[model samples]
Target: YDWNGAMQPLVSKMLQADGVTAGSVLLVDSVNNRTNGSLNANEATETLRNALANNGKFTLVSVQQLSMAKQQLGLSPQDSLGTRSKAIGIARNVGAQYVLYSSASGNVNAPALQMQLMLVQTGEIIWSGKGAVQQ
Candidate 1:
């Protein structure tokens, strides 16, 4: 799938959405795989991270910082962040104002990626969007 094609629009939407402050700190969580073990979740995560960094709008937390934050929160560096609560926890620990949660779901051949921009302090999803991954 063309992860960039799938994620760039969503990132743009996130930036332009109302109530979203510009240049805010954002934590991009690893993509959650909702497929039947068909998606390369790690690749998607890395690609989206790059896309956001390239956008140069938000202050993204680095993977190293995230790992360190995880350990500081009594979680293993590789701990499962299968829940929004955990992601929010990490976001707060990293001093990020928002958390970007994403998932790859649906059929393997034609998956769709969903993204949610959540306000870390309130656990409120301020914006959400879905994009079809080009096969």
Candidate 2:
């Protein structure tokens, strides 16, 4: 079973409820950019983002801005686990109202993805979820 397929819809709905719906401001951050060998972390993140887009999620920030911010924080946009605050710092600089980030861990066949959608001003996690996908 594809855990992201099963869980993302539910999680997406949760995020939408928190103001990441169509036309809202969204900042996809590398706050928890991690994964097992089963799931390429960057691909996993992008796949999930694409899925959300089909369902009318807000637009992610441009790569240039994200990349520049990562550079400023001494990160390369992958395996960016320790710089979560810095990721949020990037999101805040971009004037995003809501921030989305996720990470994955576990065995290849049973990897789990944990995600959180937060409000920038208040630092509140409005939605959170964990999901796994199979081969």
Candidate 3:
């Protein structure tokens, strides 16, 4: 199932936060897999990206920017953005105001999805949400 249903409301709530504004730059970090079963983290990230892009509230960073940022940081495109520091570095390199961090936890059969919107400058999680995955 697509995560749009779980993500939409959270994104809207984040937009309502004092820190957010229309067309603000955002970096959608690759999703972290904390599940006990096989999961494609990159695919999960792409799904989240598409959902956020469809909303059109913020200016989502493009894939090319991500590639360039990784290259400049001496990271291969295959590197996982698994840590806040690494993610923040990429966000800063891409000049993004915010970063959307997500992870899937629990077993693959019954996963729980969590999302957090972090301020790039301060590295503070400004907004967060959680929901059980729709089977």
Candidate 4:
């Protein structure tokens, strides 16, 4: 099963359970190493954006602009505590209150996806949850 294929229903259920409405969601493009082409990250980002839009529970923001700012400002990865923290800083800089990140992995038996939600102010992880579906 494709791990990325599991995000839609999982995100829908999570949003419903949390009662979150009309908040910005940040979709981080997977950092590309020379070993892998950009196709994977591009496709994944688009897939996630479409899924979130279809669900109508959140607004999706592109991380490209945020990353560009970080680059222009010379922010290093170590400048923040972690990826999530850096993300919060970026979101806050972009005038967003909420941010979401999705990651996926796979095994022989099934695939899995994890969705993380963070509050921009105070740099706190508001929610960390994930769901998996068999293909």
Candidate 5:
């Protein structure tokens, strides 16, 4: 069950509520599985980026290169927190004020996705939310 179709509306609503203007939203392309049943990271990010861009609320900064860094460093599941911290640090260094991290589990029996949006200046998670849908 690909929820990408249904989730677009939900994401649009959230962006509107959050006052996310065009060119503010960035898609994080890191080491993870796509929630949309896609195997390729490029394809997954492109789909998401295009969707956001089409809504006129996001600029779509591509972070696909980060995937290679994760591979070079041999990052494992245990290093998730550390990896995320380092990544956020890099993003801030590159002048990103806000960052969004998203991950999904492919288990249809317990389909779930977790998203975290943080404010880089304060190093605090301003908003953290998770949604689960069982098909």
Candidate 6:
């Protein structure tokens, strides 16, 4: 949902908060780290990637891009993100100026997501959109 409806106006607000437009580059790296669902980083990242790709004007760098770099970096497809530098390095290598990161806490029954959009060059979060659907 990218917490879409959950975040309501905040979603649109965030999209306009930056210079991001369609065809711009974005790198996605999200997870459920620290939660029992830390195991679901794959799913979390996948969903978050699609959400940004779906709602924005970005040419996102994904799977194959990550794969090529991952292999060259001696990392496996299933390797946990493990470090922010890994993702930042991937972003830089892919020529993406932005990184869309999401992290989840709580559990399946009550998940919370903290979303962040960072400027790849400086590692500063320029925008944030967060929400939780604790059901």
lDDT, candidate 1, at 125: 88
Relative to the true structure, how large is the alpha-carbon lDDT of every model?
0.83, 0.63, 0.80, 0.57, 0.53, 0.67
Where does model 3 exceed 4 Å of error? none
What's each prediction's TM-score?
A: 0.91, 0.73, 0.88, 0.67, 0.61, 0.76
lDDT of 5 by residue, 1-135 (tens): 344653465456556656344467453533256455654544534555565667765655545444444455555433442345775655554445666665656663454656565665666665554565343
Q: Return model 1's CA RMSD, one decimal.
A: 1.4
* lDDT string, candidate 4, 1-135, tens digits: 343467677666656655355555554434222221222545655666677666765666655566665765569643432376566666766656666666555543443556666666665665666666366
TM-score order of candidates, best first? 1, 3, 6, 2, 4, 5
lDDT assessment of candidate 4: 0.57
Predicted candidate 6 versus true structure: per-residue lDDT over 1-135, tens digit per residue:
334444444445668885555567887765646555435456556655666667766678877887787777777777555466877877777878887776666675566766777788888878897677443
Question: Worst 10-residue stretch by lDDT in candidate 5?
Answer: 75-84
- Summarize candidate 2's per-residue lDDT along 26-99 as a digit string, tens digits: 77654243444544445655666666555565666766766777677666655353344765777777767767
lDDT of predicted model 5: 0.53
Instruction: Note the residue pairs that clash in candidate 5.
Output: none
Clashes of 2: 0
Q: Which of 4 and 5 is the better model by TM-score? A: 4
Ranking under lDDT, best-scoring first?
1, 3, 6, 2, 4, 5
Identify the candidate with maximal lDDT.
1
lDDT of 3 by residue, 22-68 (tens): 68889888778899988876677777887777665668998888888
Candidate 1 TM-score, true structure as reference:
0.91
Best by TM-score: 1
**C-alpha lDDT of residue 135 in model 3:** 50
